[PDB]
Design a protein around this ligand. Structure first.
Ligand SMILES: Cn1ncnc1[C@H]1c2n[nH]c(=O)c3cc(F)cc(c23)N[C@@H]1c1ccc(F)cc1
Length: 339
């Protein structure tokens, strides 16, 4: 490759990192190594999670259900009683875990070699990654957007743009809902473990067997107009301060705008093309710009005056599309997190 693209590839294709990351989520790799991971294993996971969600919707069976889960998706809690899976946060953790294994299952297949390995990993992605000049117009806007939509309540770090690549995933230009109005350039963040999957298969909706209570606005692909909302889903740390952020063209269409969580939001569409969870603070439109016919919601964020008298109010917006054909990957940011 070019060196910058080589180091990116190195970075995301590091299986030792993937292993470290999974141990950090308390997954037992000694017992179920990542190289012995299969689609069937991971479905078995979902099927046992579904059975747990069932017990929370209904009311004993939960101990049977949690055990089956831990049998099929081994964990490592050491000498402590393995905890039960009982709260919304807990179940959503288990889903973040399984998603991640699916992306690793994918990476491990892909990183197998027959050319230099890094050049092989790269080719098998089927997605052009192109480093951009830091003096260029596109880098200017992206930096401004990165910083200017850093949310005031994600004050625990800053981000530094280390490097920028334009992304072009085979298939996407053509599949894309070019026709839909309301097209915006929006963020997506994810665990480092997941990039080989996302680059090679694209952003995907939730797995079919995934429990729906995990998903605030149902099983779509989620985006923010607030860089740090997305960046939080990188799960970076002082120990692992290099992450990646995605910018994608998102064909939003008419938005069904929602004040609070509804996992059945997808059936609420009834003609519309996306869900938008309304936030307290959002970038203001007097400040937007256009990059290749996609609106870029430049910061800073302002009180939108939005309020949910019924309960919890979102701090910042989110957008959910329920078909990959509404997403076109566009730029990938290499970001240093400064804690
Ligand atoms: C954890 N996860 N797995 C796939 N997608 C995600 C999240 C997400 N990933 N990345 C983003 O940029 C994002 C931007 C949002 F405004 C909102 C988001 C996300 N919510 C998604 C979410 C959060 C909790 C949950 F239980 C399920 C889904």
């Amino acid at each position: 490759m070019d060196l910058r693209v080589q180091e990116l590839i190195k970075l995301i294709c590091n299986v030792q990192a993937m292993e470290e990351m999974m141990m950090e989520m308390k997954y037992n790799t000694k017992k179920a190594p990542l190289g012995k991971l299969t689609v069937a294993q991971i479905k078995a996971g979902y099927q046992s999670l579904k059975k747990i969600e069932d017990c929370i919707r209904a009311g004993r069976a939960l101990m049977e259900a949690c055990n089956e889960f831990y049998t099929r998706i081994p964990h490592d809690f050491g000498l402590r009683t393995p905890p039960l899976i009982r709260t919304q946060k807990e179940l959503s953790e288990k889903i973040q875990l399984l998603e991640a294994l699916g992306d690793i299952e994918i990476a491990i297949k892909l990183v197998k070699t027959e050319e230099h390995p890094l050049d092989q990993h790269y080719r098998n992605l089927h997605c052009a990654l192109r480093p951009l000049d830091h003096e260029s117009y596109e880098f200017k806007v992206i930096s401004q957007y990165l910083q200017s939509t850093h949310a005031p309540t994600h004050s625990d770090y800053t981000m530094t743009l280390l490097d920028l690549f334009e992304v072009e995933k085979d298939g996407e230009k053509e599949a894309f809902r070019e026709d839909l109005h309301n097209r915006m350039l929006l963020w997506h963040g994810s665990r480092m473990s997941n990039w080989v999957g996302i680059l090679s298969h694209g952003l995907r909706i939730a797995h079919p067997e995934a429990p729906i209570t995990g998903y605030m606005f149902g099983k779509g692909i989620y985006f923010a107009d607030m860089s740090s909302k997305s960046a939080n889903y990188c799960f970076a740390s002082r120990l692992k301060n290099t992450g990646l952020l995605l910018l994608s063209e998102v064909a939003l269409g008419q938005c069904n705008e929602l004040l609070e969580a509804n996992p059945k939001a997808e059936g609420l569409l009834q003609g519309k093309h996306s869900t938008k969870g309304l936030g307290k603070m959002a970038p203001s439109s007097a400040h937007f710009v256009t990059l290749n016919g996609s609106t870029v919601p430049l910061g800073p964020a302002s009180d939108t005056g939005i309020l949910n008298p019924d309960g919890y109010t979102l701090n910042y917006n989110e957008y959910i599309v329920y078909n990959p054909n509404q997403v076109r990957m566009r730029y990938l940011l290499k970001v240093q997190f400064n804690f």
